[PDB]
Design a protein around this ligand. Structure first.
Ligand SMILES: [Mn+2]
Ligand SMILES: [Mn+2]
Length: 269
């Protein structure tokens, strides 16, 4: 079976309880995770250890909190007490865990399931070939010996409009923001990097990225996490918002792909 779970954010106990609910069995089943494995919840260390141990039985995409963790690890960004990352950062296997984490994808595609996953979704300004190329470029920089330089370069809110002519720092920053920070778009598809409200509470003319028809969403289902204030609802057919805010006292959500059946684990907080 295929299971897709939204942002775990260090909620190790809820993750394991949910997987036990569905009798997740590596070798029979595959788990997709929308990223943001770490921060806020208390068990980022256990989450990373477990997810790494799954190997080919897990298909991860990296989220913005995963990237921020790597930046803290590399000395690029300051550790925020609220993230609760110190046990992971101080772990004897931190190097092993985080060198594995930075090699993971930004984008997962399954052609037989006609299914695409990224942390924040797929901007309507991208077709599938462009999404693939951009994921490959940023994955290449993250997996390289020089990844701290890219992690430093990734911070920024501009540019917010895609063009194939984008180059250099702006190109990487846009790609990173599109895959890991996107929520709202302007009518022309341009990213808004400030509003984090629910769609009903956003200022006009902002619309959810998935409310703007895009070539990928026309041919593929898209699963994503990231946008907890969406509460996993209000999405069109074919769009699966799996982040129901577990670390915030919401729930952890698991979707089984074969029957589109949902399983939910209440937050322990
Ligand atoms: Mn996120
Ligand atoms: Mn998140």
């Amino acid at each position: 079976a295929t299971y897709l779970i939204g942002d775990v954010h260090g909620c190790y106990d809820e993750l394991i309880a949910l997987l036990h609910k569905v009798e997740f069995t590596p070798g029979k089943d595959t788990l997709w995770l929308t990223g943001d494995l770490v921060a806020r919840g208390p068990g980022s260390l256990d989450v990373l250890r477990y997810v790494k141990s799954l190997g080919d039985s897990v298909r991860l995409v990296l989220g913005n909190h995963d990237l921020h963790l790597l930046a803290v690890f590399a000395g690029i960004s300051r550790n925020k007490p609220k993230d609760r990352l110190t046990p992971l950062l101080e772990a004897p296997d931190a190097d092993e865990l985080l060198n594995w984490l930075r090699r993971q994808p930004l984008l997962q595609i399954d052609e037989e399931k006609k299914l695409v996953m990224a942390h924040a979704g797929i901007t309507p300004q991208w077709d599938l070939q462009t999404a693939k190329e951009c994921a490959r470029d940023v994955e290449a920089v993250l997996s390289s010996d020089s990844y701290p330089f890219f992690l430093d370069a990734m911070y920024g809110d501009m540019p917010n409009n895609w063009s194939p002519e984008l180059r250099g720092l702006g190109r990487l920053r846009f790609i990173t923001n599109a895959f890991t920070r996107m929520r709202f778009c302007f009518p022309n598809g341009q990213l808004d990097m400030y509003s984090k409200e629910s769609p009903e509470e956003a200022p006009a003319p902002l619309k959810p990225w998935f409310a703007i028809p895009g070539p990928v969403a026309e041919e593929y289902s898209i699963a994503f996490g990231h946008w907890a204030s969406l509460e996993g609802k209000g999405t069109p057919e074919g769009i699966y918002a799996l982040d129901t805010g577990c670390c915030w006292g919401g729930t952890l959500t698991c979707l089984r792909w074969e029957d589109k059946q949902y399983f939910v684990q209440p937050s322990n907080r």
